[PDB]
């Protein structure tokens, strides 16, 4: 697996390994929503932290999971805020 290019999964896995803790534990919450693009609920367990990911497909739901996990951790917060606003302080 591990979709080419930088992804939320790998990025997370790389953190789990770089942290010397243990790879992330993904758990499928559920799967519901529109028929065309059903909404899949994904879960991610990292150490003593947990996150969720929702997308049009389980896959994405997983990618979105790590994303949140990375954000919740504070690995994509800087950018986030930056995007939301500059606020040079």
Q: Which residue has tokens 């994303």? A: 67
CATH of the domain at 26: 3.30.160.20
Q: Domain limits at 48?
A: 1-89
Report the distance separating Cα 49 and Cα 24, nearest Å. Answer: 10
Number of structural domains (the chain) is 1
- Describe the crossing of helices 8-18 and 58-73 by its angle, rounded to 10 degrees: 50
Q: Which residue has tokens 């290019």? A: 5
The rounded Cα 80 to chain-centroid distance in angstroms is: 14
Technique behind this structure? NMR
């Amino acid at each position: 697996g591990s979709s080419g290019s930088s992804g939320p999964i790998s990025r997370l896995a790389q953190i789990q390994q770089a942290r010397k803790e243990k790879e992330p534990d993904y758990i499928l919450l559920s799967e519901r929503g529109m028929p065309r693009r059903r909404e899949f609920v994904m879960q991610v367990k990292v150490g003593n932290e947990v996150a969720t990911g929702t997308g049009p497909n389980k896959k994405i739901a997983k990618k979105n999971a790590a994303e949140a996990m990375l954000l919740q951790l504070g690995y994509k917060a800087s950018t986030s805020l930056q995007d939301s606003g500059p606020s040079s302080g």
